[PDB]
C-alpha cells in the first residue's frame, strides 16, 4: 500500500481561475460563498491512484480509429503531444492523461448537444494515454471546431480539447482545457476570462509544432502540462 513521503507545493489560487467569475454565468449559483478551509497535508491528500495496470486498448489514444464505423473522421488531422512535468521541472512518468472534445463542426457526441452541426459517423471524441518514463504523452485526432453556447446572446467557445490529468496524488489532479495558437475567439471567451492573469492564459495555448508533424499527413501541436511541485518531507514533528 501507499506511503506518506511527499508534500506538494501549495496552489496559487490567484493564478487559477477563482470560483465566482460572473461573465461565466453558470459560475454564479455553483461557487461557494464561505472561504475554503485549509488543512495540512496527510496521507489522504498525498497519495493517489496509479494506472500503470489499467488495461488500455491499443487505439485508446488514437481518435482517428477508436470509434470506427468503417472509415475516417472528416476534419484536420493532427497529433496533440507534450510532456507532463512538476513545478520543479521533473517529468511525471506513468500518469494518466484523458481527453474528450467535439468533432470538426463543434458537435459533442452527447444526448444533450442539440447544436445543428452534424455528427461525424466515424468520430467519437475520447482518448486516454498513460505518459511514458519520460513524462511524454500523445494523441492523434482531428482539430475540433468552435461551438455557440447559452452564456451571453452571441458567445462562442473557441476550439478546444478538454484534458484530465491524475499526477501522483489526488493533490495534484487537474482538469483543464487546451486552446489553439492564434484562435481569435480565445480572448472573447468568458470561460477563458475566468483566469485573471494573461500569462496564466498563455499556458493553455497549444503551439503549432511543424517539427513533430508527419509530412503529407497531419500537423502537430505541442501542449506541456505542469502539475503541483513534489518534494520530500523534511524537519517534520521535529
Amino acid at each position: 500500500p501507499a506511503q506518506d513521503n511527499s508534500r506538494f507545493v501549495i496552489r496559487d489560487r490567484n493564478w487559477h481561475p477563482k470560483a465566482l467569475t460572473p461573465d461565466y454565468k453558470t459560475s454564479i449559483a455553483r461557487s461557494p460563498r464561505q472561504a475554503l478551509v485549509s488543512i495540512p497535508q496527510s496521507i489522504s491528500e498525498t497519495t493517489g491512484p496509479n494506472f500503470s495496470h489499467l488495461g488500455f486498448g491499443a487505439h485508446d489514444h488514437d481518435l482517428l480509429l477508436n470509434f470506427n464505423n468503417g472509415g475516417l473522421p472528416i476534419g484536420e488531422r493532427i497529433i496533440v503531444a507534450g510532456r507532463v512535468v512538476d513545478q520543479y521541472g521533473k517529468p511525471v512518468p506513468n500518469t494518466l492523461v484523458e481527453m474528450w472534445q467535439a468533432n470538426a463542426g463543434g458537435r459533442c457526441r452527447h444526448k444533450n448537444d442539440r447544436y445543428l452541426a452534424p455528427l461525424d459517423p466515424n468520430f467519437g471524441g475520447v482518448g486516454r494515454c498513460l505518459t511514458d518514463s519520460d513524462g511524454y504523452y500523445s494523441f492523434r485526432t482531428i482539430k475540433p471546431g468552435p461551438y455557440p453556447w447559452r452564456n451571453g446572446p452571441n458567445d462562442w467557445r473557441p476550439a478546444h480539447i478538454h484534458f484530465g490529468i491524475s499526477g501522483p496524488s489526488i493533490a495534484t489532479k487537474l482538469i483543464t482545457q487546451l486552446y489553439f495558437e492564434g484562435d481569435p475567439l480565445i480572448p472573447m471567451c468568458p470561460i477563458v476570462k475566468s483566469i485573471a492573469n494573461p500569462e496564466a492564459v498563455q499556458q493553455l495555448i497549444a503551439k503549432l509544432d511543424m517539427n513533430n508533424a508527419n509530412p503529407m499527413d497531419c500537423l502537430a501541436y505541442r501542449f506541456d502540462i505542469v502539475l503541483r511541485g513534489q518534494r520530500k518531507t523534511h524537519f517534520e514533528n521535529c
Binding site: V37, V201, N237
Partner: protein
C-alpha cells in the same frame, strides 16, 4: 523570492465531462476497462456500504451534471494505489449524477482509520472532489459517518473547522436500502447549509 514554474491552470470540466470520463452514464459505448463506482467487489473484507447523494446549487436546485472522484483507505486503514479491475478493493473510484440519475451512488466498504502527519488518528472518512460545468476549479471535501461520533469528535481535520455547525455538513446520515447499509451525503455548493470545502 524563489519562483518555481507555475502549475497549468484549471478550467471547468464542462457539461459534457461524462463523454470523457463517465462513458456509461452518457450512454455512449464503453471500452474493456473503465474506472467506476464499484470500489469493492462483493467479497472484499470490511463492512460493505452503499453511499448515495445529491448535489445542490445555491438556489437549491439539483446539479444534474456533476462528476465526483473518491479516494479512501480499505478496511484496514490502508491506501490501495495500484489500480486494477481484478483487485477485490480499489481505493479510487468515479461516479456521477445524470439527467436520469439525480443521484450518485458508490459501492464500497467503510474506511479504516488512518493517522495524520503528526501521529494522530483521523476519524474514518472518504475524500471527495467535485467537478461540474460552472465550477472553474474543483471542490475538495470529506465525507464522515454519523455512527462514528466519538472518532469524529477527536478528528484533527474536523477540529480545524471553527464553527461546530459547519462540521455537521460533512457527516453522512446512516439509513438502509433493501437490507444493505447505506449513508446519504448531500452536498450544498452554496448557501444555507453550504458544505465545507478544503484547500490543501
Amino acid at each position: 523570492p524563489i519562483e518555481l514554474l507555475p502549475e497549468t491552470p484549471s478550467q471547468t470540466a464542462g457539461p459534457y465531462v461524462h463523454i470523457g470520463l463517465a462513458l456509461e452514464a452518457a450512454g455512449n459505448p464503453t471500452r474493456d476497462q473503465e474506472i467506476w463506482n464499484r470500489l469493492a467487489k462483493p467479497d472484499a473484507p470490511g463492512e460493505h456500504i452503499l453511499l448515495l447523494g445529491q448535489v445542490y446549487d445555491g438556489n437549491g436546485h439539483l446539479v444534474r451534471d456533476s462528476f465526483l472522484e473518491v479516494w479512501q483507505a480499505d478496511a484496514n486503514g490502508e491506501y490501495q494505489d495500484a489500480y486494477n479491475l481484478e483487485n477485490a478493493f480499489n481505493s479510487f473510484g468515479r461516479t456521477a449524477t445524470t439527467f436520469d440519475a439525480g443521484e450518485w451512488t458508490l459501492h464500497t466498504v467503510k474506511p479504516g482509520v488512518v493517522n495524520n502527519a503528526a501521529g494522530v488518528p483521523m476519524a474514518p472518512h472518504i475524500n471527495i472532489s467535485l467537478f461540474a460545468r460552472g465550477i472553474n476549479i474543483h471542490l475538495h471535501t470529506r465525507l464522515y459517518f454519523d455512527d462514528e461520533a466519538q472518532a469524529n469528535a477527536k478528528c484533527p481535520v474536523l477540529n480545524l473547522i471553527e464553527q461546530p455547525q459547519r462540521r455537521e455538513t460533512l457527516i453522512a446520515k446512516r439509513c438502509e436500502v433493501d437490507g444493505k447499509t447505506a449513508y446519504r451525503f448531500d452536498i450544498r455548493i452554496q448557501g444555507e447549509g453550504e458544505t465545507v470545502f478544503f484547500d490543501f
